[PDB]
């Protein structure tokens, strides 16, 4: 039995404003999962979901809604796991360290022979701290689904900042209907509104 405690994505924190943290908690007595926060304030209505999957293992995850203002002042949220000798606990909180806003760069790949109806849009986001970064792709002023793009895990630059790449394949029908795509980065150091953007097109 092992457990993990997630952080709120910058997208959930500053765009949706409805951030949440989820206690993963990956068998005779059902396992109880409760929440606590360092300030002593009450825990919101935490919704717990039990999943019977898959290879002879049980998954019980609890999602706890948190407040965006609370997370900024350094509120520590702790999750505890009890079974019918000792309990396991994970604690999540705002990352420490300096803040650095991201630089955002967008590029389009040239036409590749045989694949004329598809293109690849690449977004470089770099020199930001801390590493927590959300990426969304906008087309027609409407955000594209998340499954459409792929973002690499943050990695350290030669400086103290982190960088991330985002890759998005687009179809001809899309860029011909409107040849403009926006790669948006959500980071708490971005000012104002925690957003840095760049537009790209396919020629």
């Amino acid at each position, epitope marked *: 039995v092992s457990a993990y405690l997630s952080r709120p994505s910058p997208f959930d924190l500053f765009i949706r404003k409805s951030p949440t943290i989820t206690c993963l908690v990956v068998s005779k007595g059902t396992v109880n999962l409760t929440w606590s926060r*360092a300030s002593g304030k009450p825990v919101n209505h935490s919704t717990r979901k039990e999943e019977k999957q898959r290879n002879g293992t049980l998954t019980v995850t609890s999602t706890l809604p948190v407040g965006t203002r609370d997370w900024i002042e350094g509120e520590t949220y702790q999750c505890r796991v009890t079974h019918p000798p000792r309990a396991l606990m994970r604690s999540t909180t705002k990352t420490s360290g300096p803040r650095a806003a991201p630089e955002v760069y967008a590029f389009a790949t040239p036409e590749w022979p045989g694949s004329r109806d598809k293109r690849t849009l690449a977004c470089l986001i770099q020199n930001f701290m801390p590493e927590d970064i959300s990426v969304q792709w906008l087309h027609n002023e409407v955000q594209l689904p998340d499954a459409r793009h792929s973002t690499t895990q943050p990695r350290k630059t030669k400086g103290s900042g982190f960088f991330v790449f985002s890759r998005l394949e687009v179809t001809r029908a899309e860029w011909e209907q409107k040849d403009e795509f926006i790669c948006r980065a959500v980071h708490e150091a971005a000012s104002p509104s925690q957003t840095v953007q760049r537009a790209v097109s396919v020629n």
Partner: antibody
Amino acid sequence: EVQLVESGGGLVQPDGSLRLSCAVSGYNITSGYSWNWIRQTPGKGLEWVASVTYDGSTNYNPSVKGRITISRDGSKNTFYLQMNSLRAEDTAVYYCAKGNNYFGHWHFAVWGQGTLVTVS
Amino acid sequence: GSDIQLTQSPSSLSASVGDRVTITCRASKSVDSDGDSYMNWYQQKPGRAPKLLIYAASYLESGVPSRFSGSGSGTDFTLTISSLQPEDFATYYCQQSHEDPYTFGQGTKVEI
């Protein structure tokens, strides 16, 4: 970050009354966490005195209950400790400390410099 | 009188840099509850205020060196230091957060 600065300590006569203050900076005491008073007799052990939470709830150590009281001033972001009927047992260094909650049980994460109260 | 009383051992000890030190804390009543033990450990160097090293008996406060480790349960708790350092010459207190009023040990003084 949170910094606690005590004041109001000094020489005091028995049966008198003294008021100690803790000036908090970097965090508003009405926002959360517990705010406690813990005294130490020099050369001896440490004892918890009283606590006020961010909601105004007060909790006292029964060994001092009835003579002492803990107050809060949100506008000045300061909480106080009024002592009455001082005794030689009360001579001690008085720290204030911020309390972090862990499932209904508090630990003293940040402590002030402490101010000395001496009765004769 | 009805309080939980905390007794530490040893009261004082002399050590050298690099030594491994073990301090014990005994409680009148069990401070265990809900699968956790509400015993906290504090370090106090001379002339300064105590500092939190461990809470819940095993968890280390952020920024505390890894050499400090807590163990125990019920009425028996042990603060362990893997290797002693010059800045560790201080008094070490345990504190139970199970019942009001919160109480402290007498303190274990470590002299380098």
